[PDB]
Amino acid sequence: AIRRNMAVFSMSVVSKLTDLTPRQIRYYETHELIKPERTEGQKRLFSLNDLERLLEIKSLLEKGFNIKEIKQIIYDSQ
Amino acid sequence: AIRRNMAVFSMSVVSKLTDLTPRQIRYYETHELIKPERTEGQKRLFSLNDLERLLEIKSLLEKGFNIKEIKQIIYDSQ
DNA sequence: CGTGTCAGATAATCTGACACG
DNA sequence: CGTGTCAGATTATCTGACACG
Ligand SMILES: [Ca+2]
């Protein structure tokens, strides 16, 4: 009943779910790889969709790909 | 992430999902109807099962039951 | 008795910049 | 150029106390 586009996870929980630091997660948003929702105080809130996109980035980073290369891939799989 | 016993939601998220104020939520804990995980800094983190538990409490209060009636309804056998 | 509300304290996340491999 | 760390700032949640239906 919690939908995959619902912003429900805070930084620290998302970081534990993904084994990525607050630093890496913020960096991928800076490079337009992801864009989580913000509370009114501008804190980030992640959805399950965000969860899946961060893991996608993690893997391709561990297959040796650049950030600029990962941009191409996440937006050309079709 | 759908480990139903995994603490993933902060107070404000649980609040919005349950339609209960943090005041109500913390009160039901102090009267031992729910006990959520804590970060090392003692903020609360709730699971999907916590969510179910809160919603149960909410509906039972809505039906006229005391806090101590509800504590019997939920615990003894499970 | 259960909740709203405000007060002070502490934790958590914010941006930005230097440093490192 | 991808990540760590440290500074300062603000937001979010903490406990506890007074009000009030
Ligand atoms: Ca928002």
Q: Could you write out the DSSP letters of every residue in B1-38?
A: ---TT---B-HHHHHHHHT--HHHHHHHHHTTS---EE
Kindly state the tokens that stand for B74. 């939920």
Among the listed residues A23, A32, A25, the one whose alpha carbon sits nearest the alpha carbon of residue A68: A32
In chain A, count of helices (H) and strands (E)? Answer: 4, 2
CA-based torsion, A27, A32, A38, A42: positive or negative: positive
Q: How far is the CA of B65 from the centre of ligand 1 (A)?
A: 36
Among the listed residues A56, A53, A20, A60, the one whose alpha carbon sits nearest the alpha carbon of residue A11: A20
| Inter-CA distances, B71 with A2, B28, B61, B68, Å | 27, 10, 11, 5
At how many Å resolution was this determined?
A: 2.3
| Nucleotide D2 C1' to residue A49 CA (A) | 23
Identify the experimental approach. X-ray
In chain B, count of helices (H) and strands (E)? Answer: 4, 2
Partners of residue B13 in chain A, C-beta under 8 Å: 8-10, 45
Which nucleotide is the nearest neighbour of A40, by CA and C1'?
A: D11
Distance between CA atoms of residues B22 and A63, nearest Å: 44
- CB A48 to CB B1 under 8 A? yes
Distance between CA atoms of residues A65 and A56, nearest Å: 12
Distance between CA atoms of residues B60 and A13, nearest Å: 30
What chain A residue is nearest to B48 in terms of C-alpha separation?
A2
Distance between CA atoms of residues B24 and B43, nearest Å: 16
Three-class SS state of A66: coil
Q: How far is the CA of B68 from the centre of ligand 1 (A)?
A: 38
How far, rounded to the nearest angstrom, does the alpha carbon of residue A69 sit from its chain's CA centroid? 16
